[PDB]
Amino acid sequence: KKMPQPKTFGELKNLPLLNTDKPVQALMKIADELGEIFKFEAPGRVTRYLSSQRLIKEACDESRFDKNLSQAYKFVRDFAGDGLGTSWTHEKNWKKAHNILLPSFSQQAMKGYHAMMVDIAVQLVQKWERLNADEHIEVPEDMTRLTLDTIGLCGFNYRFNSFYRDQPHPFITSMVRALDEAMNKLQRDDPAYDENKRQFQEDIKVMNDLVDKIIADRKASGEQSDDLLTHMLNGKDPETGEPLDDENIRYQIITFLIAGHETTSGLLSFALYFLVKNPHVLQKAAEEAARVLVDPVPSYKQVKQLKYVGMVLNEALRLWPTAPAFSLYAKEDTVLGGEYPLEKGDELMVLIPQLHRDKTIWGDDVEEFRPERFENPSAIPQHAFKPFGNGQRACIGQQFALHEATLVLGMMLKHFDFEDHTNYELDIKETLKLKPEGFVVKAKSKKIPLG
Numbered sequence: 001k002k003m004p005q006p007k008t009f010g011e012l013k014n015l016p017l018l019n020t021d022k023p024v025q026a027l028m029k030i031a032d033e034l035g036e037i038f039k040f041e042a043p044g045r046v047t048r049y050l051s052s053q054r055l056i057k058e059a060c061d062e063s064r065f066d067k068n069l070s071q072a073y074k075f076v077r078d079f080a081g082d083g084l085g086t087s088w089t090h091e092k093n094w095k096k097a098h099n100i101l102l103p104s105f106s107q108q109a110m111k112g113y114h115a116m117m118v119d120i121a122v123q124l125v126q127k128w129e130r131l132n133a134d135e136h137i138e139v140p141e142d143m144t145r146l147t148l149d150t151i152g153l154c155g156f157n158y159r160f161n162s163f164y165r166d167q168p169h170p171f172i173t174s175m176v177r178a179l180d181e182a183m184n185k186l187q188r189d190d191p192a193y194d195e196n197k198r199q200f201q202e203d204i205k206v207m208n209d210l211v212d213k214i215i216a217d218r219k220a221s222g223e224q225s226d227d228l229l230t231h232m233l234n235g236k237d238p239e240t241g242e243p244l245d246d247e248n249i250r251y252q253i254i255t256f257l258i259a260g261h262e263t264t265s266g267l268l269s270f271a272l273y274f275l276v277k278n279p280h281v282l283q284k285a286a287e288e289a290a291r292v293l294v295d296p297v298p299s300y301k302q303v304k305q306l307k308y309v310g311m312v313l314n315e316a317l318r319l320w321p322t323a324p325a326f327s328l329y330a331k332e333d334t335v336l337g338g339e340y341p342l343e344k345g346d347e348l349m350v351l352i353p354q355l356h357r358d359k360t361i362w363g364d365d366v367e368e369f370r371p372e373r374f375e376n377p378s379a380i381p382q383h384a385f386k387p388f389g390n391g392q393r394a395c396i397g398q399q400f401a402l403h404e405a406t407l408v409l410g411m412m413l414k415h416f417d418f419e420d421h422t423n424y425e426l427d428i429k430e431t432l433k434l435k436p437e438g439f440v441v442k443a444k445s446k447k448i449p450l451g
């Protein structure tokens, strides 16, 4: 069967379609008009975008398809290196890090991070408790402060102290600026790109300089903490028997911050947006938080008892998965969906927001925010809900992100009533991840002691 394809621009094929502020949202609108699969060509490049559960279930077959590094993540690799996210599955350091790091990211390993997550969540609550009557909350901005600080604390026992400042830590500043440059190179040898190829190097330096010092500092001290750095400095891969070397440990810490901060911040921001736009759902979630969070400080077990809050987060991830696409390649020649022959090496993109709007899986009301869709998670078919990727290349931080977001949203709902005082119109800014730009609320304290 012949594959649909969106509009072309002569010798540029489809490439100008992504020369836009909102490429994923453009790709979603194309999927709306062309259907479950469409070909996307560029000068010397071909990929196929998948939007249906019927095809994505095959793409998630790890015997047939492996993770591909997209063009963007090849540029990210210039400072993320061969950390988990930007390494190929067949690279020795991927499987080593995967085996060493998976125990540090278990649902059960969250018990050790809980106290430091509470540390940063308390700072967030206290900041909002301390706002004056006339004042409002910049939601993604504060969620990003929380998630970056939480990864820094739980990751390598480092305090970015984001709630003490307006201009971020020089590391954070230079990371985002480096991520920006990596993104900008998507639409670009020529000597006009000489200053862009000089500033990139400076941002890589500050990130490398500080994390390497931290690792050197910890090796010299020999101190043992509850962070991922300790586990990485003492872990051994059961298969090779080898530990990670210091350079790869550096890339892993850079990777935790790239991979975790924007997605989790976006999730919290989208979750609060849907709550203020659905007051009946907010009330049901607030009643749960009040019922369950009976102590001044949330316990690890209390966070696990926040069932509805977790459903709220999963429904937010259904509508706006904050890492909205992943890339695959065919391991061998194969036929997709019984009608699309693929050659070894052919690339696929999974368009996750469109998968999550497949009316054959979720029903006709896919645009509605309904947390009750997740009452029984086992009813959802295989590969129908994939906000954390697929298989052995799935998000290693899934339990970390969901524990942090359930804790923080639980505390938010316990301690404040929220007002959508501007009747905010959703505006989704796209970097490599999604976030509701300009989202803003008020929050009136329920005056509950906190500690």
Ligand code: HEM
Pocket: 067, 084, 085, 098, 255, 256, 257, 259, 260, 261, 263, 264, 267, 321, 322, 323, 325, 326, 327, 386, 387, 388, 389, 390, 392, 393, 394, 395, 396, 397, 398, 400, 401
């Ligand atoms: C709501 C929050 C998050 C979302 C939606 C998310 C999404 C994803 C997705 C879709 C992938 C697969 C990417 C691909 O196939 O190319 C991935 C991979 C990854 N994520 Fe997350 N992520 C989140 C939070 C986090 C956090 C908190 C961490 C903490 C370090 C993290 C670390 C990673 C790593 C290391 C990988 C690569 C894993 C591997 O291939 O071995 N993520 N993430």
